């Protein structure tokens, strides 16, 4: 899945880079790139290579020396920059890679210096759990928007997102050169899709595993009730509406695509389920662990592995991605 | 006290260099860019950030202008503990702090963007152990020691100086390409008074480590050939050497040159034992990794135990000094 996403989207990144060339940004002394929420895995390496290779390839054609490249790798201060920097030791030459700790909800970089901003699977995370999920907890059974969720949950999540995403765009707007491009890829939904397993498979199946622990009386039902993940899956329409209100970007590309969550290149339904569960753990573990402690979380994932395995044998789940490319105007 | 003494004595030099930036109206540019070479993870980088931030804010008040934004690059080798550094920096408004992993012997930053470069106790470390500390035959010159000593043949001295000339030149050439016209660079490093002999006067730590090693050779727990052909990639230059190297690189003017010598141990401690133990701990903390890599964990732990006994003994008779060289450059042409 992670592989599928990066490979499907690579041409979009490359097209955005090509836009930079018809502005002669490759003729400037340095090209500045930012990756928002880079984590520590291989995706940042691949973003660096894509830009580096495309920049080198084009300067070969035009018989000029390539601009130098500066890549800022942004993530929250708790990110494992140590590992990231150790792995980057095995691009160089004319290539200067920085760590930029901080939240992308706010200023991170000098005014109008960025030529390219990139983000893959970060900007769906909210700055806080949305307000108005309370006293008394609305959204009783669940940890995200669901089939069973009252209309107010939906509206609260959307409102939080509108705030956050607007603050993201405003910050990036201040930091980008005229005609700079920004490529944003995030977990999303098809508008005509219902809530529940269609769009938020992972949040639904986690709430199931929690509910099994409540049922075993190992967790208070009030805890599940007033637990909510600070994460939203927008439609492309929502994204585009938010962008429309911030008058400093032109939309150059908008896209939604839906894949199977489970890995195709595996024939056995077992393993397929276990892998998907492992995958889900790997990006939900820290938020779950922090809320329920190590002992209970270990139990939650064991039941999760049983739920997904069962799901593989009947209706296999999907996952949906929204992609937008913006150009800085005015 | 020592690390504290160095940062506090040199703070005015940093501030003067910053003030030079103001008379170039760099505070009127959109961003002021600062680099700290070899920042490690301790409190010194925080203090450099504060010094610049405070001075920049203070002077924009005075001249009634819009404050430039501040960008600070914190450079160190990859596998420096940037995790801890970044966590501590969280306890930062129009103030953008970056990690810049890599060696300062080489390019690290875009061409001509830096206004201020700062470095405290880094650039004395060489890029490699210097070549030519072994004869044609294959015999190791510099028999007893791990740095330049009283007992060292002339070729050791000349090889270390040559390595430093290479390294320091490469540092200056790289920074020259990366600094704006009239940018300042403040370099503070462990050094020597020219008229000082080699040995305990200038390289206390290398001398006392070679002692501890020699005690392990004496207990036959380490081959004498290992000590013989082991050499630390570190030099303590005179201010004259530094100035000669700078003179050959035609892109900097010297604005300040300084040598000063302090007691190594913390003076505000009355007990000789603790004074010695502290100095030893201090010495371990900056020599551990290169000692450990060479002799393994088991014998290194023994080396530091004997080191702690040697320094404690030294505190009670002749207390050691340590010497610092400081230079400030301006980017010209
Ligand atoms: N406000 C914020 N500012 C910066 N990083 C953030 C953030 N909120 C979440 N993140 C980071 O976003 C990342 C999401 S995981 C995706 C990582 C990478 N883009 C990839 O494709 O693999 C995490 O590392 C998380 O710490
Ligand atoms: N070539 C090189 N490039 C970058 N950092 C280097 C380096 N050689 C040594 N260093 C770093 O220089 C540091 C010296 S310790 C000094 C820490 C800090 N400047 C202070 O005043 O406390 C070490 O962390 C070491 O890893
Ligand atoms: C890192 N990450 C997420 O953060 C994520 C996700 N699906 C939804 N989200 C929120 N996937 C597949 C993922 O790899
Ligand atoms: C890192 N470091 C050194 O590298 C050093 C030193 N004194 C001498 N040297 C070489 N001190 C105090 C120090 O902290």
Residue numbers in the entry:
A (entry chain B): 26 to 115, 124 to 167, 171 to 366
B (entry chain A): 25 to 115, 125 to 366
Which lines from the publication concern this structure?
Our phylogenetic analysis showed that although the YM genome does not appear to encode XMT-type caffeine-producing enzymes like Coffea and Citrus, it does contain three recently and tandemly duplicated genes that encode CS-type enzymes, IpCS1, IpCS2, and IpCS3. A second enzyme, IpCS2, shows activity only with 3X to produce TB, while a third enzyme, IpCS3, exhibits a preference to methylate TB to form CF. Thus, collectively, these three enzymes appear capable of catalysing a complete pathway from xanthine to caffeine.
In order to gain insight into the structural basis for the convergent enzyme activities, we obtained a crystal structure for the terminal enzyme in the pathway that forms caffeine. As is typical for the SABATH family of methyltransferases, IpCS3 exhibits a Rossman-like fold composed of seven β-strands surrounded by five α-helices which bind the methyl-donor S-adenosyl-L-methionine (SAM), as well as an α-helical cap which binds the methyl-acceptor theobromine. Although the IpCS3 structure was obtained in complex with its product, caffeine, it can be assumed that the binding mode is conserved for its precursor, theobromine. Indeed, our computational modelling of theobromine in the active site of IpCS3 predicts it to be oriented as we have discerned from the diffraction data. In CcDXMT, the NE2 of His160 and NE1 of Trp161 form hydrogen bonds to carbonyl O2 of TB when positioned for N1 methylation; yet, in the structure of IpCS3 these corresponding side chain groups form hydrogen bonds to O6 of TB. Despite these two residues being conserved for H-bonding, the substrates are rotated 180° along an axis going through N1 and C4. Thus, the conserved His and Trp residues interact with opposing carbonyls in TB/CF but still position the substrate for N1 methylation. Tyr368 of CcDXMT is found to participate in π–π interactions with the ring structure of TB Lanzarotti et al., 2020; yet in IpCS3, Asn353 is found in the homologous position and the amine forms a hydrogen bond with N9 due to its proximity within 3.2 Å, which is additionally stabilized by Asn221 and His236. Because the residues in these positions of IpCS3 and CcDXMT differ yet contribute to TB binding, these independent replacements represent convergent structural solutions for N1 methylation of the substrate.
